[PDB]
């Protein structure tokens, strides 16, 4: 039921860019684009939680073809327009430092993707991934811990759960459980999909909770910048009590390093009832209830 590797690097699907919109509002840090591709002309099917590969043009410094980079799929299986003809991605442009040869280095595939024009053809492989899939259980609780572009798999879940058009299109999945997104970003204009997430929380105040950790605008109790691990420690007892429910699934997505502060918070909460979190967590992974994709 999970499509995997319908297209591979040796014979990719050639899709076309339909649109390339900016997500970072003025006053925000960096460039993050929402890119939609046209899938008509092939048979790329995918579901929520998966990723595709993009093969950028050109050669590296040794003269070899650039290889694929993976990107979380940011649309549901139906695409943003709910017509089963497109796929979307949420791509941050990577750029960095001086002590790494020269001046500013720009990431190859991410610079290529964030500046790509409508009508352009893109080499697409996949889909791949079975680690971030959503259960078809409409009464599941879903905890979502995202930073930056890790919002991408979370958006596919929430849209499937809460978009009017999705609910009419998926008669077998009418979500009636509870979901909680904790979303860590640097500024308020860096809240990707802010307007759509907050509209969801207004229509479903009992089925969706939205918490932000905004580091240039909020301080944690210790006077430092507010990061997602600070918000998780604030609500550690609550999150622990939801995680004990047999129905609860936890998703963690974002840049590497966020995992250690989430564990230390849930560790202190579990200990209060004589549970060693690192052992409870192994059982959760085994059961398919603890989902992690960091990079
Ligand atoms: C499963 C998965 C899902 C992903 N999903 C997404 C997504 O939804 N959105 C998204 O934007 N990205 C996503 N990424 C990351 C993405 O695949 C690419 O790694 C990223 O876009 C950068 O690729 P590039 O081609 O731009 O950079 P490259 O040109 O390959 O540059 C990256 C290389 O430069 C170096 N480098 C990077 N950062 C620094 C730094 N701060 N200091 C020093 N050196 C550094 C490292 O050697 C790194 O290998 C995902 C990755 C994985 C594995």
All domains of the chain, ordered by start, with CATH? 1-128 (2.40.30.10), 129-295 (3.40.50.80)
Beta strand 179-185 with 208-214: parallel, antiparallel or unpaired?
parallel
Nearest CA to ligand 1 atom 18: 69
List residues bridging with 183 in a β-sheet.
146, 212
Experimental method: X-ray
* Distance, CA of 247 to CA of 268 (rounded, Å): 22
Cis peptide before 165 (omega within 30 of 0): no
Q: Please tell me the number of Cα atoms within 13 Å of 161 on its side-chain side.
A: 29
* Distance, CA of 179 to CA of 142 (rounded, Å): 5
* Distance, CA of 158 to CA of 199 (rounded, Å): 11
Residue whose pair of structure tokens reads 């992974």 in the numeric block: 285
What is the CA(180)–ligand 1 centre distance, in A?
A: 27
Indicate the helix (H) or strand (E) that contains 38: strand 32-38
* Distance, CA of 15 to CA of 9 (rounded, Å): 14
Specify the 3-state DSSP secondary structure of 199. helix
Tell me the two tokens of residue 198.
């907050």
8 A C-beta contact, residue 75 and residue 51: no
What is the CA(107)–ligand 1 centre distance, in A?
A: 7
Is position 289 annotated in a ligand binding site? no
| Resolution of the model in angstroms | 2.3
Residue 149 Cβ < 6 Å to ligand 1: yes
Residue 152 Cβ < 6 Å to ligand 1: yes
Residues labelled as active-site residues: 71-72, 253, 293, 295
Residue 156 Cβ < 6 Å to ligand 1: no
* Distance, CA of 260 to CA of 120 (rounded, Å): 40
Nearest CA to ligand 1 atom 32: 107
């Amino acid at each position: 039921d999970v499509p995997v590797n319908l297209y591979r690097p040796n014979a990719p699907f050639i899709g076309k860019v339909i649109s390339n919109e900016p997500l970072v509002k003025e006053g925000g840090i960096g460039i993050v684009q929402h890119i939609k591709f046209d899938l008509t002309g092939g048979n790329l099917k995918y579901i929520e939680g998966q990723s595709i590969g993009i093969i950028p043009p050109g050669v590296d410094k040794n003269g070899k073809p650039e290889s694929l980079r993976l990107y979380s799929i940011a649309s549901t299986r139906h695409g943003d327009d709910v017509d089963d003809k497109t796929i979307s991605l949420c791509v941050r442009q990577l750029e960095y430092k001086h002590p790494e040869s020269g001046e500013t280095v720009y990431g190859v595939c991410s610079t290529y993707l964030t500046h790509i024009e409508p009508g352009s053809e893109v080499k697409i492989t996949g889909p791949v991934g079975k680690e971030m899939l959503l259960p078809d259980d409409p009464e599941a609780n879903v905890i979502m811990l995202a930073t930056g572009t890790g919002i991408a798999p979370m958006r596919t879940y929430l849209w499937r759960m809460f978009k009017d058009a999705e609910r009419a299109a998926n008669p077998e999945y009418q979500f009636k459980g509870f979901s909680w997104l904790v979303f860590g970003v640097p500024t308020t204009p860096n809240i990707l999909y802010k307007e759509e997430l907050e509209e969801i929380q207004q229509k479903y105040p009992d089925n969706f909770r939205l918490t932000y950790a905004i580091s240039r605008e909020q301080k944690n109790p210790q006077g430092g910048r507010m990061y997602i691990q600070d918000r998780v420690a604030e609500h550690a007892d609550q999150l622990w009590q939801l995680i004990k429910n047999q129905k609860t699934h936890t998703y963690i997505c974002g840049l590497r390093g966020m995992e250690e502060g989430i564990d230390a918070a849930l560790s202190a909460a579990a200990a209060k009832e004589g549970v060693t979190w690192s052992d409870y967590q192994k059982d959760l992974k085994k059961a398919g209830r603890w989902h992690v994709e960091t990079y």
